[PDB]
Amino acid sequence: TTQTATDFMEIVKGRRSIRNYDTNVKISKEEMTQILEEATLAPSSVNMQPWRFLVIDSEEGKATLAPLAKFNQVQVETSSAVIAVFGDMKAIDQLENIYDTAVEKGLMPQEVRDRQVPAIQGMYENVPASALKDSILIDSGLVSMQLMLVARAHGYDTNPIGGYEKDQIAEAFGMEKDRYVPVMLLSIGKAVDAGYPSVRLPINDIADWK
Amino acid sequence: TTQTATDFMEIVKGRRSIRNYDTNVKISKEEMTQILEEATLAPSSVNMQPWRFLVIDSEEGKATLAPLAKFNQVQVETSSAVIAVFGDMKAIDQLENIYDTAVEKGLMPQEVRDRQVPAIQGMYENVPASALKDSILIDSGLVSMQLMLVARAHGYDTNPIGGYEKDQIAEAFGMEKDRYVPVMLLSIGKAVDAGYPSVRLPINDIADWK
Numbered sequence: 453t454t455q456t457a458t459d460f461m462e463i464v465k466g467r468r469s470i471r472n473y474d475t476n477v478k479i480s481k482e483e484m485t486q487i488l489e490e491a492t493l494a495p496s497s498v499n500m501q502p503w504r505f506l507v508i509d510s511e512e513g514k515a516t517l518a519p520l521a522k523f524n525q526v527q528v529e530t531s532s533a534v535i536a537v538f539g540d541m542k543a544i545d546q547l548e549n550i551y552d553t554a555v556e557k558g559l560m561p562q563e564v565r566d567r568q569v570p571a572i573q574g575m576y577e578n579v580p581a582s583a584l585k586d587s588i589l590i591d592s593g594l595v596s597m598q599l600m601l602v603a604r605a606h607g608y609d610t611n612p613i614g615g616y617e618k619d620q621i622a623e624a625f626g627m628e629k630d631r632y633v634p635v636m637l638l639s640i641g642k643a644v645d646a647g648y649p650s651v652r653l654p655i656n657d658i659a660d661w662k
Numbered sequence: 663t664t665q666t667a668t669d670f671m672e673i674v675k676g677r678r679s680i681r682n683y684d685t686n687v688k689i690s691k692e693e694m695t696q697i698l699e700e701a702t703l704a705p706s707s708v709n710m711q712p713w714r715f716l717v718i719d720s721e722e723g724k725a726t727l728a729p730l731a732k733f734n735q736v737q738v739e740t741s742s743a744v745i746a747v748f749g750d751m752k753a754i755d756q757l758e759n760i761y762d763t764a765v766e767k768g769l770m771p772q773e774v775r776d777r778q779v780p781a782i783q784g785m786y787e788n789v790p791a792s793a794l795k796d797s798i799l800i801d802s803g804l805v806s807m808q809l810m811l812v813a814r815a816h817g818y819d820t821n822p823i824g825g826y827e828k829d830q831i832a833e834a835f836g837m838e839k840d841r842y843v844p845v846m847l848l849s850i851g852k853a854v855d856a857g858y859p860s861v862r863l864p865i866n867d868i869a870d871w872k
């Protein structure tokens with residue numbers, strides 16, 4: 453249905469927030485899996501990979517989401533899916549699994565893992581929750597950007613969305629409480645129109661050389 | 663020699679944290695401005711573009727940065743530059759400038775601008791500082807990811823860095839106090855080695871279909 457793109461600069465420069473999608477185009481399980489695999493290649497602090505996703509694409513899921521998305525119902529209804537991005541406050545719990553996997557795949561020495569897992573755990577035991585949260589938001593921002601661009605590599609488009617009932621969404625989809633920080637929604641689908649161009653500030657307004 | 667790339671998947675898949683750079687490669691102010699122009703095409707809440715940058719590339723600047731960077735000295739010393747990323751807590755103050763420019767450049771009808779600006783201003787009037795900061799952290803993540811990928815399009819590489827004296831960097835570089843949230847440092851330069859591959863979690867461990 454969609455055109456694969458490879459040109460980095462067209463993928464980046466041509467990205468806009470697209471609010472209207474083709475309601476007859478759906479993204480397959482395997483293609484969404486690939487898009488997410490490609491997106492999650494992003495970096496994160498100590499490779500903790502705190503990002504978590506709901507791929508809301510079923511009729512019943514769209515129905516549950518719609519009431520929560522405020523003023524953003526066109527994106528929610530017409531989209532192939534809405535990807536709900538969260539940060540996991542328990543992200544450091546995966547460290548042993550991540551570093552164990554690095555060891556198993558030949559990518560990290562055992563001795564290195566033996567030393568850095570307790571070292572990193574130690575550091576994070578003395579980080580306030582507010583600091584950890586700030587770090588998880590930055591990293592979730594990172595993966596969300598790469599996701600938007602990966603979407604366009606696959607011929608899709610997206611709209612990052614903050615206008616939704618963030619405090620209701622976890623419970624609405626059966627997620628455990630007090631764990632998952634809502635980051636954004638991201639609609640994804642085949643664009644049916646070009647969107648609208650927008651301005652950016654001149655660089656001399658926002659950067660200083662030192 | 664530094665070599666540009668066009669292929670999106672090679673730019674993304676090939677991105678690692680590079681910690682050692684060619685000390686004889688420097689990035690011109692011209693090329694760095696073009697890199698930042700391309701990175702800042704990133705989206706942000708209400709297009710408020712809250713990100714701000716210090717391009718620390720001078721001998722004096724690098725000497726000023728070094729004592730604040732901890733055990734990330736190899737990156738700071740060898741890199742062509744370190745880009746210090748901040749979020750401006752007064753970002754909304756540029757809203758009218760941003761939207762006025764859209765009208766001037768014919769990208770937005772005045773009608774639309776005259777309705778959207780006051781509505782947006784009203785909305786952010788009832789957003790507390792803590793929620794504004796979260797939003798600015800997310801957007802600063804967004805632009806920082808795009809900056810890493812754009813660097814590789816130009817033949818460079820980066821390392822995102824959180825291990826620095828965040829509380830001290832604004833004052834060290836003469837920035838207005840109590841305004842700019844430190845996001846990260848990002849070393850940039852020509853890679854002199856490939857770095858280390860790293861693992862990512864299985865998608866079905868971090869994503870759920872609904």
Ligand SMILES: Cc1cc2nc3c(=O)[nH]c(=O)nc-3n(C[C@H](O)[C@H](O)[C@H](O)COP(=O)(O)O)c2cc1C
Nearest residue numbers: 468469524612613614615636650705706707708709
């Ligand atoms: C985190 C975030 C939240 C956003 N919230 C909404 C939203 O709720 N609804 C919407 O239509 N657009 C939303 N926007 C889209 C912005 O308005 C858009 O990125 C900005 O106007 C620049 O336009 P562009 O994406 O087409 O380049 C959001 C963008 C971001 C990054």
Ligand SMILES: Cc1cc2nc3c(=O)[nH]c(=O)nc-3n(C[C@H](O)[C@H](O)[C@H](O)COP(=O)(O)O)c2cc1C
Nearest residue numbers: 495496497498499678679734822823824825846860
């Ligand atoms: C926000 C942020 C802060 C980071 N802090 C550091 C740092 O202080 N020093 C460092 O060497 N790497 C730092 N990293 C790099 C991570 O360790 C790295 O991204 C992760 O191990 C995955 O490896 P990769 O980027 O090569 O794919 C940071 C990454 C991010 C995104």
